[PDB]
From TrEMBL, chain C:
Residues of the full protein shown: 81 to 120 of 120
Lineage: Bacteria, Thermotogati, Deinococcota, Deinococci, Thermales
Organism: Thermus thermophilus (strain ATCC 27634 / DSM 579 / HB8)
Identification of the protein by name: V-type ATP synthase, subunit (VAPC-THERM)
Binding site for Ca(2+): E37
Amino acid sequence: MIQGVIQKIAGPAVIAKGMLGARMYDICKVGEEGLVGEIIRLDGDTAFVQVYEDTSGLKVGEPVVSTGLPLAVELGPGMLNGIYDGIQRPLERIREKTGIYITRGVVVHALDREKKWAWTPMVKPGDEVRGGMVLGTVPEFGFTHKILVPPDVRGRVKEVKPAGEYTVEEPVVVLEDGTELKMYHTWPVRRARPVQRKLDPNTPFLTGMRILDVLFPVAMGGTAAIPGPFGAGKSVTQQSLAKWSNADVVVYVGCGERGNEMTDVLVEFPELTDPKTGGPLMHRTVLIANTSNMPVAAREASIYVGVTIAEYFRDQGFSVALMADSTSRWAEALREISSRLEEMPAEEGYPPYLAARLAAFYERAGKVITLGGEEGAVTIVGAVSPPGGDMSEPVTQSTLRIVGAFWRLDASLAFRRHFPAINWNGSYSLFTSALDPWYRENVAEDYPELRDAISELLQREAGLQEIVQLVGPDALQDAERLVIEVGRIIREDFLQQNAYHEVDAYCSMKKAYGIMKMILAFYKEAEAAIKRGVSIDEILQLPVLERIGRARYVSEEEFPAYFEEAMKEIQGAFKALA
Amino acid sequence: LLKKEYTGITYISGPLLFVENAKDLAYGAIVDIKDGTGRVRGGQVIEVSEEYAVIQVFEETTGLDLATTSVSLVEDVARLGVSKEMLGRRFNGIGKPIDGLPPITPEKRLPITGLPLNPVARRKPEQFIQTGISTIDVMNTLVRGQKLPIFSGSGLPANEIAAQIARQATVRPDLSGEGEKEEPFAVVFAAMGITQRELSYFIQEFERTGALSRSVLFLNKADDPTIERILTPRMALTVAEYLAFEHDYHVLVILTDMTNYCEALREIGAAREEIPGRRGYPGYMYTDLATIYERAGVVEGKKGSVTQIPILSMPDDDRTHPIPDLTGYITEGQIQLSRELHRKGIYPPIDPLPSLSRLMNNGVGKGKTREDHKQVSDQLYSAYANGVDIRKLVAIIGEDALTENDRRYLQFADAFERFFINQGQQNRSIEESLQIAWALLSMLPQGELKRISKDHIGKYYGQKLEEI
Amino acid sequence: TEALLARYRERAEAEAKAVREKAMARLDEAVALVLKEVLP
Amino acid sequence: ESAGELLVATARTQARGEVLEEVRRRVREALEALPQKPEWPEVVRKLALEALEALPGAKALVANPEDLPHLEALARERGVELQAEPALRLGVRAVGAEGKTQVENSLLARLDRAWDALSSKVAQALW
């Protein structure tokens, strides 16, 4: 191993001399306490090291040892139901070892080594194994964890251990060349894991939010960016994604954000139920936490660790949702390190390779055929925290060139307690056309037409609002006034959704379709009535409006009855006016 | 126990000096810089190498020289001695008494920067603090363990609001259900760049209410060194965490004028030529502010707590300025004062729409306050937003053109501003604030209260504004 | 009124004297401890 | 109200401070009385050894001429020069080779740098 000594300490950066032979992007242990760092520059006999831990108290001349291997994660059973640091250290174990504060330098395995897993072989001696095949299986929490061959390993089976209870270290398959395959393998976090083929997204990433699911959808292997100013509802939206999404596994990455949010997830999820599996919600969740006051350089490590774990669970055949709590803080970490490197910045101090890093991160999403022949998918939702809500900033602009959906949060809507606070005028989705076949057979044959009609009504309202705000509602004609009123009904009764309500937190596609159909039926009857000379006030004072206005709080198990009754009542009421 | 002295000063410029043979100075160590006249001034090591060590002098470098100046190590890690006997004392912003009293006997020395709290070691802030102010209690509720700043302006009365909250803050165990007798708040007060007028106001208020015995004061005045402004909140929060999580106290930290903290941070960053961010502020300002703000909360298995109420003056009343912008990304909501309400004569002039509390839901409702709190607050928000929109409409198209429902919303906006927001120096229990709220909501037709369930409307709707 | 302040002043004088008198009974031992630690 | 309690507390704090100042004076006289007490050669030799351990690159030692007759044997054995200087008493100092580093091991300095650490133990002992 290459050994050297510290020559210079500056914030999260250490320069080590005597490191001739150390490789780019290898892990080195800095100081007597063995702090983890990654080499990111070689110069003569020196190596520049970015340290993933606090550097206070280090002295010049302390040892620096290069491990010879890149930053890698352990990938195997034991990751579900867990919370990890940026470099994949179990935080429960860190607490048990160092109390309520995170002290630096703690060495602990990511996967528990004393746990026993029920192993069911799926291979026999003499079988040819290629990268990604399923050697066997172990139950985790109601999931069926498949033990995979590492991507770059080929051979023929020599012996298979029988069904039993084994730890993650036990060699469960031995090949002819002698290579021992265990329940886990290590993977570099900056190398994307290979796949057989990339597919075309054709199914929806159901979220539980009406606005995102209807107007601006995301496909099961797509990418979305949700930028917003502080106070708009990024965290609530992402937590709701985690609680209600139709993904098998959720990897939630708290990159440089509040620690109370991590505590909230840990405390709350163990009591909620997986929408599909039925078990506790925490059991489908992996948590990666590098809070704001944890070391800055570990934000990048957290992003890469999370995306690699998501790829792994995809490789087992799962649909994985990846939430990045803020890519803006990852950009901030890169800017800091480039300040230490003495690099020349691009716009706003960020390094010019920021867009390349973001692109590489987002391109790991996709629906794929795994090396094992099964279908997997990773869906990435990325939170961006532009300063001042400005969308003309490097991070938002670099993200918008690569994501397929743009969920734009608005502070004006959040000020009025309109949530989820998505600007439907400024948002878009490039998946709506591709998901139409799925909608036409899973929601309703005419669902896209209802959705288009609602979008057109909203566009008309947006056109009329500029006129109203300067000349008063009364100056309009009756048709335009009805459009304003129905646009308001859409805002308050369809677009708004209460994340803290026992029923309105989640909304199914059928319920959204029903609410839209009720709104459009009311609009058609109201237009007819206007032509029949009915007063706008009469229409507005009707009692059916209350029925539509409370429809989102009704529960799923009884909603279709409410829906049939309200559809009858709409005609009944507009016949009464005559 | 021995003292090492370095005399190889090779370069002094601005607030930095280079020491040549200082390999045994750790990164982040504290040093004493002795001048030819024997005067000693502090400093921190900010970069170290085999060539030299870069030291950051806490006060001006006037009088230093390369011939008779020596640097001695003080501690490997910047630490602070803390004792329970800190309560009732005054310190100068670096930790030294300015009360004329003997120095404390430390029970322990704690690193001022602190250590991050493990997320698995935290518990959810859930205990509701009653501030006696309706705009906060009903709509922007504060809970123990929260970090809730006050977004202030130049000439606005944010100090008055902080003093009133400190005076009236209570926890109301009767609603929670524990039924045990309360305990009072310890106040840790950190002032950065504070003027004598404001310091006089605070000292007089605390003396008036008797809280100066159960409080710790760190006072960096606007005549005190600028780089020392960076140590003040860290020492304050070290003492706060010590008290809370070793002696089971409930501490209330007030950091007055965090704008001054950010200005000092920019001064240092510009000196070191680090990569800036948005308006000359250092690119790591977000992390630096987080290291201060995320030292609040509540821990599992501990009875004590740390609440933070930072006060920052928004430059040019601009909410998109980097200081307020980054604070709002870290803190759990914000209370924003309105220059317009202040000019109308309203106290406390808290604007609800740009104000938010993110931890309110975990502190209100069944078994905490009473069940209609959240819906009442939501309905008040909807009604006030509509009222402000109608007021915007009226300023163009005149009052006479309004429909009767819109006229109702206007009257609601006015009565809100004049009876809910405006309360002077009164202490209002949560019950009285909710009563006033339902009274204002009764001004609207019972059918327009879409945010409130039918049961609550039946229970509470219909009280007039006859409150006295 | 001033009576409470006078009573408290008397209490303060009594407390100060009591602290001093308690201290005098161990001063040499503390000096010895500080000498043991400070000396090598 | 609590104004009287403030008076009581300030009186108690002032008394404790004065007692600790008395203890400090006792310790400081005890230290300055060493050059008479027959151990004062051995203590200065131990301090010089500690200073030399503090500087790996030590090149010289400094002490008052009175301490020289005891420190000479150590200085010659350790390969470091010795110089007579009316510097601080009650200890020795080591000078680095380049002349820019220096370690001093006076007992007054050690008292100054240990008082804060020892105050807790002293307070627990007294009360």
